[PDB]
Every structure is written in structure tokens, then in C-alpha cells.
Amino acid sequence: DTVVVGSINFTEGIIVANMVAEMIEAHTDLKVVRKLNLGGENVNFEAIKRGGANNGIDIYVEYTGHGLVDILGFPEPNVYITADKQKNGIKANFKIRHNMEDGSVQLADHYQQNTPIGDGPVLLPDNHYLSTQSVLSKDPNEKRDHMVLLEFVTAAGITLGMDELYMSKGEELFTGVVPILVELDGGVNGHKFSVRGEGEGDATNGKLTLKFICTTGKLPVPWPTLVTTLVQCFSRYPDHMKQHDFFKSAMPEGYVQERTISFKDDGTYKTRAEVKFEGDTLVNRIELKGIDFKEDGNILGHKLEYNFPPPSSTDPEGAYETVKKEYKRKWNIVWLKPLGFNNTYTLTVKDELAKQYNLKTFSDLAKISDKLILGATMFFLEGPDGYPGLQKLYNFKFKHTKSMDMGIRYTAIDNNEVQVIDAWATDGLLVSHKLKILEDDKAFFPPYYAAPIIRQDVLDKHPELKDVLNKLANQISLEEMQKLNYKVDGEGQDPAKVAKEFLKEKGLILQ
């Protein structure tokens, strides 16, 4: 029959949409409907959910970063740590997305304060984040209500910058493997329960193995809700970040971790815990009080699956794999092979500006942001992977922020209307306006490798599509894609003509 191919109203998307349409019409005897969307939020994601039957798309080109946003909530799962000098400790924000049976998600918003127990000196960190991977399992020979947890945590967000390095005396307590005891006394909506966990931690590798048992009978809440609450001192800090490990510096006297966990459309947990050494053993002693929970709700009704969401990886291959697997497992959508270019957000300035203020990286731009006016697309300003996520890590304080269309932002930076723009790495106008891209030194941004995305049922009806579309694999480099975007924007041309020309040129389309 026919297949619907959608795209948002931007140059690169239209070009690649026409390329896919031409590949399908050339290498298969199938009909290709082309649809250009309004530009609404998650328009392509919801369209490919609906499919062609319900006035939606069946195929579109997505970027791994926006995929991380769409199926994992990319910025949110990272534990974003900043310093509170007043309380001589740290604060942290994150959100957990607990999977449910019907594919929905229970949101759990975590606000966290950590304060040293002793009066010793402690390391106050620069803005950074903890990337966490958690795997939940069961012992088959354990008749009690229990959870087996295996966890890997790595600290990120601080750049290695060709400067010498080598930090604290509590750091030396984690050189080897440390035994771990965790005690939790909790009450949720009047249920009183206790949890005891035993295990061990290797901080040089960032690995925790623990087994928790509910000593009071049946646990009145699903186990994944207690995962966060149930030892961030075991996080593996890379050698260049070892000066920012607050948690180890507070040892052995320990620290106090207070946390507020808000379950969307349900109750809240309030936890206070003390994490400290007792003899050889690191102990986490927690009091948990949950107040306002719906009795038939997702939490008290046990409507959450026994899993934790997979982590969002900044590695390009890891990102593609995670996005492909999750789009498959949830909503049943196939990520095909990448086209080969990475069209990433990047803050860019006039090269004159960078020369004058000696700007190399995002941190330098941040220290003078108050003087500057940022002009960016609505996608960068609104999207969680754009300016808001950036500020979670970078502390940008711009004088103004003006939403602009693509193209108009380039003329505006040329005319000094704005000083910083959200240039996209494949933008055609990047050659002509003499701009400098700055470096994402804290490495907030994810990969934005473009790849075609197809519904599984359309793949079933027409199995040939997989190979014909995968023919465009590693074919379009960043330079080539930029050349085509310039051949549309810099020189007014029809996108379909440029697409067909490029396809015939490389022999992908014979004629």
C-alpha cells in the first residue's frame, strides 16, 4: 500500500524526509505520502504512536538526543549536585520515572540536601552530576519480601583540561571494598514497616551490591520507590574530579541526607538519613514518612513494575543502543541505522566576540553571560535538552533571551542584535557568517545523531523497507549534510531536487 513519512518544518528535516521518500520510491514499488507537521510539542513522536491509520506518520528521522528526551526524560534522571556553602554541604535535584504495567510512568521528583555530621573540613563541589544505573532482581531461594540491587554510579560534568592533578582523608577509606548496612524505619499512610539491607561497595569501580529484606512482612510500597532512599559516597569519581567528592570527604563522621520525594498525583516521602562509618561498616540509617498517598493509587496499590529505567548515556553508541532498545520495548518502534552526522545544539558567537573576550568554552561564556543577549530557536529555549537543562549544570545568566526562527537568528547575530545563538552543527548558514562554536566542556549535551525511525507494524507489512532505508547508513557526513543545507538556505533551491541530486550522485539512486 502506502507509507506516511513525516518531518518538522526545518531545512535538514525536510531534506532527509525527501531523501527517505526517494529511496522508498526508487528501491520499492510503494507509495510515499509526505506530511509536514505544524511544529507542536512531540508532534513526530505522537504521530508515529498513532500511525497512518489514525492520521499520523509511520516514518521520521529522529536524533538520539531527542530520543533520550522522549523515552527517558534525558536531563531529569541525572543527579544534579550544587553546593550550599551556608549549610557547608550540597543540594541535589533529579526525577525518577517509574515504569508501570500500562506503559505509563509514575513521576518521583527528588529534592535532596546533604550536610556534614562532624565539624571537620569538607570538599564543596562545583556543579556536577551523578549518572546512575540500577538493576533490580530477586533471589529465587528467598521466601521473604526482598530486593536484590546492583548499582553503578559515575560522576560526570567536569572537564579534563590539560592541567596537572593527582585529596581527602575520608577518600582513603574507599580504596578497597567496604561492607554496607542499611536500616530503614518507615511509615506510609499509617503502615509501619522496616527494611534491613546488607552488602558491599567498591567505590574505585562505583559498584554496589545489596540485598534488602522487609523485616516486618509485606512491604506496603513498591520496591523501586525505596531505591533512591536506600549511599552516594560509593560513586566513582574520575581522578580529575576527586576534589569535588563531598560524600567521601565527610567520612568517617558521616553526613545527613534529607530528601523530599514527591510522587506526581499521589503522596510524598520525607526521609532523613545518617550515612556514617560504624567500625569497618558504612551504615545508612533512614527514617521515612509518607503522608498523603492515595489508597488505590499507584504506590499503595502496587501498580509499578519491578524494574528501574535504564540510564541515559552520553556516549554516542551507548545513546543509540539505549534509545533503540527502549523505543522497541515501549511503543514498539524500530530505530534504523544512523545516517552518520551529529546535528548537535551549540552556543556560538561571532569570532570577533570570542577573540575580544578570549572565549573558548561554555564556562567562559557563562562568566560573561550577563552582558550578552542570547537568541535561540523555540526548540532550544523550550526543550529540556536545551537551555533549561544547560542551566541545571552551567549557571548561565543572560541579560535577555529572545526566541527566533531559524535563519533570522544568524542575521541577528551578524547585526549584533544578539551575541550568542543556538547554532545547529549542520546549519547551512554556518559557513557564511564567520562564527565560532564554543566547547561544551561540562558535556551536558547528548549526541544528536540522526537516524530513521519506523513503526514495527509497517515494517511487518513491508519487510523490504529495512534494507532500503539502511542503505543510507554512514552515507551523509556532517560536511555533506551542511553542504545540502547551504544549497537550500544560502542558495534558494527546492529540497526535493537537492535530495534526488545527492542520492543519484553517490549512486544510492541509480535514476
Coordinates of C-alpha atoms in Angstrom, one line a residue:
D1 CA 0.0 0.0 0.0
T2 CA 1.3 3.4 1.1
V3 CA 3.6 4.7 3.9
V4 CA 3.5 8.1 5.5
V5 CA 6.8 10.0 6.0
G6 CA 6.7 13.0 8.3
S7 CA 9.0 15.9 9.2
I8 CA 9.1 19.1 11.2
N9 CA 9.4 22.4 9.4
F10 CA 13.1 22.8 9.3
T11 CA 15.6 22.5 6.5
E12 CA 17.5 19.4 7.4
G13 CA 14.3 17.5 8.3
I14 CA 12.6 18.3 5.1
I15 CA 15.7 17.3 3.1
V16 CA 16.2 14.0 4.8
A17 CA 12.4 13.3 4.7
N18 CA 12.5 13.8 0.9
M19 CA 15.6 11.5 0.8
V20 CA 13.8 8.7 2.5
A21 CA 10.8 9.2 0.3
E22 CA 13.0 9.0 -2.8
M23 CA 14.8 5.9 -1.5
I24 CA 11.4 4.2 -0.9
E25 CA 10.0 5.2 -4.3
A26 CA 13.2 4.1 -6.1
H27 CA 14.1 0.8 -4.4
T28 CA 10.5 -0.4 -3.7
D29 CA 7.2 -0.4 -5.5
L30 CA 5.4 1.5 -2.7
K31 CA 3.6 4.8 -2.4
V32 CA 5.1 7.6 -0.2
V33 CA 2.9 10.2 1.3
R34 CA 4.8 13.2 2.6
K35 CA 3.5 15.2 5.6
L36 CA 4.9 18.3 7.2
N37 CA 3.7 18.8 10.7
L38 CA 2.6 22.0 12.5
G39 CA 5.5 22.1 14.9
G40 CA 3.7 21.2 18.1
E41 CA 5.4 19.5 21.1
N42 CA 6.4 15.9 20.4
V43 CA 4.4 16.1 17.2
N44 CA 6.5 13.4 15.4
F45 CA 6.6 11.1 18.5
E46 CA 2.8 11.2 19.0
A47 CA 2.3 10.9 15.2
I48 CA 4.3 7.8 15.0
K49 CA 2.5 6.5 18.0
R50 CA -0.8 6.9 16.1
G51 CA 0.3 5.6 12.7
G52 CA -1.1 6.3 9.3
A53 CA -4.5 4.8 10.2
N54 CA -5.2 7.5 12.8
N55 CA -3.9 10.5 10.7
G56 CA -0.2 10.1 11.8
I57 CA 3.2 9.4 10.4
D58 CA 4.9 6.0 10.0
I59 CA 8.5 7.0 9.4
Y60 CA 10.6 10.0 10.5
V61 CA 14.2 11.0 11.2
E62 CA 14.9 11.4 14.8
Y63 CA 18.1 12.3 16.7
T64 CA 19.4 10.2 19.5
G65 CA 19.4 13.1 22.0
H66 CA 15.7 13.9 21.4
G67 CA 15.1 10.2 21.6
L68 CA 16.7 10.2 25.1
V69 CA 14.4 13.1 26.0
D70 CA 11.3 11.3 24.6
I71 CA 11.7 7.8 26.2
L72 CA 13.9 8.5 29.3
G73 CA 13.4 12.2 30.1
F74 CA 17.1 12.9 29.3
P75 CA 18.1 15.7 31.7
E76 CA 16.0 14.6 34.7
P77 CA 17.4 11.1 35.8
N78 CA 20.9 12.7 36.3
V79 CA 21.5 13.7 39.9
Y80 CA 22.5 17.4 39.6
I81 CA 24.6 18.4 42.5
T82 CA 25.4 22.0 43.5
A83 CA 27.0 23.5 46.6
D84 CA 25.3 25.1 49.6
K85 CA 28.1 26.9 51.3
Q86 CA 25.8 28.3 54.1
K87 CA 25.0 24.8 55.3
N88 CA 28.5 23.6 54.4
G89 CA 27.2 20.9 52.2
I90 CA 25.4 20.1 49.0
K91 CA 22.0 20.2 47.3
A92 CA 20.7 18.0 44.5
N93 CA 17.8 17.7 42.1
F94 CA 16.5 14.9 40.0
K95 CA 13.4 13.0 38.9
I96 CA 12.8 9.2 38.6
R97 CA 10.4 7.8 36.0
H98 CA 9.0 4.6 37.4
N99 CA 7.6 2.3 34.7
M100 CA 4.0 1.0 35.1
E101 CA 2.3 -2.0 33.6
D102 CA 0.3 0.0 31.1
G103 CA 3.4 1.7 29.7
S104 CA 2.6 4.9 31.7
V105 CA 5.1 6.5 34.0
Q106 CA 4.9 7.4 37.7
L107 CA 7.0 10.6 38.3
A108 CA 9.0 10.9 41.5
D109 CA 10.6 14.4 42.0
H110 CA 13.6 14.3 44.4
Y111 CA 14.9 17.3 46.3
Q112 CA 18.0 16.5 48.4
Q113 CA 20.1 18.3 51.0
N114 CA 23.3 16.8 52.4
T115 CA 25.0 18.3 55.5
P116 CA 28.2 17.1 57.2
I117 CA 27.7 15.4 60.6
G118 CA 31.2 16.2 62.1
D119 CA 32.8 19.6 62.2
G120 CA 35.8 18.6 60.0
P121 CA 36.6 20.3 56.7
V122 CA 34.7 19.0 53.7
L123 CA 35.0 19.5 49.9
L124 CA 32.4 21.7 48.4
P125 CA 31.9 20.8 44.8
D126 CA 31.4 22.7 41.6
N127 CA 28.2 21.9 39.7
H128 CA 28.3 18.3 38.5
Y129 CA 26.1 15.2 38.2
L130 CA 25.9 11.6 39.1
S131 CA 24.8 9.1 36.4
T132 CA 23.2 6.1 38.0
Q133 CA 22.4 2.6 36.7
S134 CA 20.3 0.4 38.9
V135 CA 19.4 -3.3 38.3
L136 CA 16.7 -4.9 40.4
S137 CA 16.3 -8.7 40.8
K138 CA 15.1 -11.4 43.1
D139 CA 16.8 -14.2 45.0
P140 CA 14.9 -17.4 43.9
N141 CA 15.6 -19.0 47.3
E142 CA 14.4 -16.1 49.4
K143 CA 10.9 -16.6 50.7
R144 CA 10.8 -13.1 52.3
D145 CA 9.8 -9.8 50.6
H146 CA 13.1 -8.6 49.3
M147 CA 15.1 -6.8 46.6
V148 CA 18.5 -7.5 45.1
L149 CA 20.1 -4.3 43.9
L150 CA 23.2 -4.0 41.7
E151 CA 24.2 -0.4 41.1
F152 CA 26.9 1.5 39.1
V153 CA 27.3 5.3 39.7
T154 CA 29.8 7.6 38.0
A155 CA 30.3 11.3 38.5
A156 CA 30.5 13.5 35.4
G157 CA 30.2 17.1 34.3
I158 CA 33.7 18.5 35.0
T159 CA 36.2 18.7 32.1
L160 CA 39.7 17.3 32.0
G161 CA 41.6 20.3 30.7
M162 CA 45.4 19.7 30.2
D163 CA 46.1 20.9 33.8
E164 CA 48.0 18.9 36.4
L165 CA 46.2 16.9 39.1
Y166 CA 47.0 13.9 41.4
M167 CA 42.6 14.5 48.0
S168 CA 40.9 13.9 51.4
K169 CA 41.5 11.5 54.3
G170 CA 38.0 10.0 54.1
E171 CA 38.8 9.2 50.5
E172 CA 41.3 6.6 51.6
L173 CA 38.6 4.6 53.4
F174 CA 37.0 3.7 50.0
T175 CA 40.2 2.4 48.3
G176 CA 39.1 -1.2 48.9
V177 CA 35.7 -2.9 49.3
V178 CA 33.6 -1.7 52.2
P179 CA 30.7 -3.6 53.9
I180 CA 27.4 -1.8 53.9
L181 CA 24.5 -1.9 56.4
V182 CA 21.2 -0.1 55.6
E183 CA 18.4 0.3 58.1
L184 CA 15.1 2.0 57.1
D185 CA 12.2 2.7 59.5
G186 CA 9.3 4.0 57.6
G187 CA 5.6 4.8 57.8
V188 CA 3.4 5.4 54.9
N189 CA -0.3 6.4 55.4
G190 CA -0.1 4.7 58.8
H191 CA 1.6 1.5 57.6
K192 CA 4.7 1.0 59.8
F193 CA 7.5 -1.0 58.2
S194 CA 11.2 -1.7 58.4
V195 CA 13.8 -2.7 55.9
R196 CA 17.3 -4.1 56.5
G197 CA 19.9 -4.3 53.8
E198 CA 23.3 -5.9 53.8
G199 CA 26.0 -5.8 51.1
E200 CA 29.2 -4.2 49.9
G201 CA 30.6 -1.3 47.9
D202 CA 33.6 -0.8 45.6
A203 CA 34.0 2.9 45.2
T204 CA 37.0 2.7 42.9
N205 CA 34.7 1.0 40.4
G206 CA 31.4 2.7 41.5
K207 CA 29.7 -0.7 42.2
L208 CA 27.2 -1.5 44.9
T209 CA 25.7 -5.0 45.6
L210 CA 23.0 -5.1 48.2
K211 CA 20.2 -7.4 49.4
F212 CA 17.3 -5.7 51.2
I213 CA 14.6 -7.6 53.2
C214 CA 11.4 -6.2 54.7
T215 CA 11.8 -7.4 58.3
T216 CA 8.1 -6.6 59.1
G217 CA 6.3 -8.7 56.5
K218 CA 4.9 -7.5 53.2
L219 CA 6.3 -4.2 52.0
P220 CA 3.4 -1.7 51.8
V221 CA 5.0 0.2 48.9
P222 CA 6.7 -1.0 45.6
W223 CA 10.4 -1.6 46.0
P224 CA 11.6 0.8 43.2
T225 CA 10.2 3.8 45.3
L226 CA 12.7 2.9 48.0
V227 CA 15.7 2.5 45.8
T228 CA 16.8 6.2 45.9
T229 CA 16.2 6.4 49.6
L230 CA 18.0 3.1 50.4
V231 CA 25.0 5.7 49.8
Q232 CA 26.2 8.2 47.2
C233 CA 29.7 8.1 48.8
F234 CA 30.4 5.0 46.8
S235 CA 30.1 6.9 43.5
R236 CA 33.2 6.6 41.3
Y237 CA 34.8 10.0 40.9
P238 CA 37.3 10.3 38.0
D239 CA 40.7 11.4 39.1
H240 CA 40.2 15.0 37.8
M241 CA 37.0 15.4 39.8
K242 CA 38.3 13.9 43.1
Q243 CA 38.5 17.4 44.5
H244 CA 34.6 17.6 44.3
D245 CA 33.6 14.4 46.1
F246 CA 31.7 15.8 49.1
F247 CA 30.4 12.5 50.3
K248 CA 33.8 10.8 50.9
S249 CA 35.3 14.0 52.5
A250 CA 32.7 13.9 55.3
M251 CA 33.8 10.5 56.4
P252 CA 34.2 8.8 58.8
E253 CA 32.0 11.2 60.8
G254 CA 29.4 11.0 58.0
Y255 CA 26.7 13.2 56.6
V256 CA 23.0 13.7 56.9
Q257 CA 20.9 13.2 53.7
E258 CA 17.5 14.8 53.9
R259 CA 15.2 14.3 51.0
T260 CA 11.7 15.1 49.8
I261 CA 10.2 12.8 47.2
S262 CA 7.0 14.0 45.5
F263 CA 5.0 11.4 43.6
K264 CA 3.0 13.1 40.9
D265 CA -0.7 13.0 41.6
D266 CA 0.0 11.0 44.8
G267 CA 1.7 11.4 48.2
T268 CA 5.2 12.3 49.3
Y269 CA 8.0 10.7 51.2
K270 CA 10.1 12.8 53.6
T271 CA 13.3 11.0 54.5
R272 CA 16.1 11.8 56.9
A273 CA 19.1 9.6 57.0
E274 CA 22.6 9.4 58.5
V275 CA 25.4 7.9 56.4
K276 CA 28.4 7.2 58.5
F277 CA 31.0 4.6 59.4
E278 CA 30.5 2.3 62.4
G279 CA 33.7 0.3 62.8
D280 CA 34.5 -1.1 59.4
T281 CA 31.0 -0.8 58.1
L282 CA 29.4 2.0 56.2
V283 CA 25.8 2.4 57.6
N284 CA 22.8 4.2 56.2
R285 CA 20.2 4.7 58.8
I286 CA 16.9 6.2 57.4
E287 CA 13.6 7.4 58.8
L288 CA 10.9 7.7 56.1
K289 CA 7.5 9.3 56.5
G290 CA 5.0 9.2 53.6
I291 CA 1.9 11.3 54.2
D292 CA -0.6 11.9 51.5
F293 CA -0.9 8.7 49.5
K294 CA -4.0 7.5 47.6
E295 CA -5.0 4.1 49.0
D296 CA -5.9 2.8 45.5
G297 CA -3.0 4.9 44.0
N298 CA -0.1 3.6 42.0
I299 CA 2.1 3.5 45.1
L300 CA -0.2 2.0 47.7
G301 CA -1.9 -0.2 45.0
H302 CA 1.4 -1.7 43.8
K303 CA 0.9 -0.7 40.2
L304 CA 4.7 -0.3 39.5
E305 CA 6.9 -2.8 37.7
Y306 CA 9.9 -4.3 39.4
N307 CA 12.5 -2.5 37.3
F308 CA 14.4 0.7 37.1
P309 CA 14.7 2.8 34.0
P310 CA 17.9 2.3 32.0
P311 CA 20.4 5.1 32.3
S312 CA 20.9 7.9 29.7
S313 CA 24.4 7.6 28.3
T314 CA 26.4 10.5 26.8
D315 CA 28.4 8.0 24.7
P316 CA 27.1 8.2 21.1
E317 CA 26.9 4.4 20.6
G318 CA 25.5 3.9 24.1
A319 CA 22.9 6.5 23.4
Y320 CA 21.8 5.0 20.1
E321 CA 21.6 1.5 21.7
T322 CA 19.6 2.6 24.7
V323 CA 17.2 4.7 22.6
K324 CA 16.8 1.8 20.1
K325 CA 16.1 -0.8 22.8
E326 CA 13.7 1.4 24.7
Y327 CA 11.8 2.6 21.6
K328 CA 11.4 -1.1 20.8
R329 CA 10.4 -2.4 24.2
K330 CA 8.0 0.5 24.8
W331 CA 5.6 1.6 22.0
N332 CA 7.3 -0.9 19.6
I333 CA 9.3 1.4 17.2
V334 CA 12.4 0.5 15.3
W335 CA 15.5 2.7 15.2
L336 CA 17.2 2.1 11.9
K337 CA 20.9 2.6 11.2
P338 CA 22.3 6.2 11.7
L339 CA 22.8 8.4 8.7
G340 CA 26.2 9.4 10.0
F341 CA 26.0 13.0 11.1
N342 CA 25.6 14.5 14.6
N343 CA 23.5 17.7 14.4
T344 CA 24.0 19.0 17.9
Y345 CA 23.0 22.2 19.7
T346 CA 25.9 24.5 20.3
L347 CA 26.1 28.0 21.7
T348 CA 28.1 30.1 19.1
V349 CA 29.3 33.7 19.0
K350 CA 30.9 36.0 16.4
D351 CA 34.5 35.2 16.1
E352 CA 35.3 38.8 17.0
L353 CA 33.4 38.5 20.3
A354 CA 35.3 35.3 21.2
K355 CA 38.7 36.9 20.3
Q356 CA 37.9 40.1 22.3
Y357 CA 36.7 38.2 25.5
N358 CA 39.0 35.2 25.0
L359 CA 36.2 32.7 24.8
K360 CA 37.0 29.1 24.2
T361 CA 34.3 27.1 26.1
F362 CA 30.8 27.3 27.6
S363 CA 32.2 28.1 31.1
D364 CA 34.0 31.2 29.7
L365 CA 30.7 32.3 28.0
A366 CA 28.9 31.8 31.3
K367 CA 31.2 34.1 33.3
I368 CA 30.2 37.0 31.0
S369 CA 26.7 36.0 30.1
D370 CA 25.1 38.9 32.0
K371 CA 26.5 41.3 29.3
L372 CA 25.2 39.2 26.4
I373 CA 21.8 38.6 24.8
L374 CA 21.1 35.0 23.7
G375 CA 18.9 34.5 20.6
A376 CA 17.8 30.9 20.1
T377 CA 15.1 28.8 18.4
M378 CA 12.0 27.8 20.4
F379 CA 13.2 24.2 20.4
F380 CA 16.4 25.2 22.4
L381 CA 14.5 27.5 24.7
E382 CA 11.6 25.2 25.5
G383 CA 13.2 21.7 25.2
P384 CA 14.5 20.0 28.4
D385 CA 17.7 19.1 26.4
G386 CA 18.3 22.8 25.6
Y387 CA 18.7 25.9 27.7
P388 CA 16.9 24.7 30.9
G389 CA 19.0 21.5 31.1
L390 CA 22.1 23.6 30.3
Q391 CA 21.3 25.9 33.3
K392 CA 21.0 22.8 35.5
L393 CA 24.7 22.5 35.1
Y394 CA 26.2 25.7 33.7
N395 CA 24.9 28.7 35.7
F396 CA 24.2 30.9 32.6
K397 CA 22.8 34.3 33.5
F398 CA 21.9 36.0 30.2
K399 CA 20.6 39.6 30.1
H400 CA 17.8 38.6 27.6
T401 CA 16.7 35.6 25.7
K402 CA 14.7 36.1 22.5
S403 CA 13.0 33.2 20.6
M404 CA 13.8 33.5 16.9
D405 CA 13.1 31.5 13.8
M406 CA 16.0 29.6 12.0
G407 CA 17.9 31.9 9.7
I408 CA 16.7 35.1 11.4
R409 CA 19.0 34.2 14.4
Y410 CA 22.0 34.2 12.0
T411 CA 21.3 37.7 10.6
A412 CA 20.6 38.9 14.2
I413 CA 24.0 37.8 15.4
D414 CA 25.7 39.3 12.4
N415 CA 23.9 42.6 13.2
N416 CA 24.9 42.4 16.9
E417 CA 21.2 42.3 17.8
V418 CA 22.2 39.1 19.8
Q419 CA 25.7 37.9 20.9
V420 CA 25.0 34.1 21.3
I421 CA 22.9 31.8 19.2
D422 CA 21.9 28.2 19.4
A423 CA 23.7 27.2 16.2
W424 CA 23.0 23.6 14.9
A425 CA 26.1 21.8 13.8
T426 CA 24.7 21.2 10.3
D427 CA 23.2 24.6 9.7
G428 CA 24.0 25.8 6.2
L429 CA 24.4 29.4 7.3
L430 CA 27.4 28.4 9.5
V431 CA 29.9 28.8 6.7
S432 CA 28.9 32.3 5.6
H433 CA 28.5 34.3 8.9
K434 CA 32.1 33.8 10.3
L435 CA 31.0 32.3 13.7
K436 CA 32.9 30.4 16.4
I437 CA 31.3 27.3 18.0
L438 CA 32.3 27.1 21.7
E439 CA 33.1 23.9 23.5
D440 CA 30.6 22.0 25.8
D441 CA 33.3 21.4 28.4
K442 CA 30.9 20.1 31.1
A443 CA 29.5 17.8 28.4
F444 CA 25.8 18.4 29.2
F445 CA 24.7 17.9 25.6
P446 CA 23.8 14.4 24.4
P447 CA 24.6 13.0 20.9
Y448 CA 22.2 14.2 18.2
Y449 CA 23.0 11.5 15.6
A450 CA 20.2 11.4 13.0
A451 CA 18.6 8.1 12.1
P452 CA 15.4 6.9 10.5
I453 CA 12.6 5.6 12.8
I454 CA 9.9 3.3 11.5
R455 CA 6.8 1.6 13.1
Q456 CA 7.2 -2.1 13.6
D457 CA 3.8 -3.0 12.1
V458 CA 4.7 -1.1 8.9
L459 CA 8.0 -3.0 8.8
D460 CA 6.0 -6.2 9.1
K461 CA 3.6 -5.3 6.3
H462 CA 6.6 -4.3 4.1
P463 CA 9.8 -6.1 5.3
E464 CA 11.9 -4.7 2.4
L465 CA 11.9 -1.2 3.9
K466 CA 14.6 -2.1 6.5
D467 CA 17.3 -2.8 3.9
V468 CA 16.3 0.0 1.5
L469 CA 16.4 2.6 4.3
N470 CA 19.5 1.1 5.9
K471 CA 21.3 1.7 2.6
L472 CA 21.6 5.4 3.8
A473 CA 23.9 4.3 6.6
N474 CA 27.0 6.4 7.3
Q475 CA 26.3 7.9 3.9
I476 CA 25.8 11.6 4.9
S477 CA 28.6 13.1 6.9
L478 CA 28.3 16.4 8.8
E479 CA 30.1 18.2 5.9
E480 CA 27.8 16.8 3.2
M481 CA 24.7 17.5 5.2
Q482 CA 25.9 21.0 5.8
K483 CA 26.5 21.5 2.1
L484 CA 23.0 20.4 1.3
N485 CA 21.5 22.7 4.0
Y486 CA 23.5 25.5 2.4
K487 CA 22.4 24.5 -1.1
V488 CA 18.8 25.0 0.2
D489 CA 19.2 28.1 2.5
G490 CA 22.2 30.0 1.2
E491 CA 21.2 29.3 -2.4
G492 CA 17.4 29.1 -2.7
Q493 CA 16.6 25.6 -4.1
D494 CA 13.9 23.0 -3.8
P495 CA 14.7 20.5 -1.1
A496 CA 13.4 17.5 -3.2
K497 CA 15.8 18.4 -6.0
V498 CA 18.8 18.6 -3.7
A499 CA 17.8 15.3 -2.2
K500 CA 17.4 13.5 -5.5
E501 CA 20.6 15.1 -6.8
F502 CA 22.5 13.9 -3.7
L503 CA 21.0 10.4 -3.9
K504 CA 21.9 10.0 -7.6
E505 CA 25.4 11.5 -7.1
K506 CA 26.5 8.8 -4.6
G507 CA 24.9 6.0 -6.7
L508 CA 22.3 5.3 -4.0
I509 CA 19.6 6.1 -6.5
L510 CA 20.6 4.8 -10.0
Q511 CA 18.0 7.0 -11.8

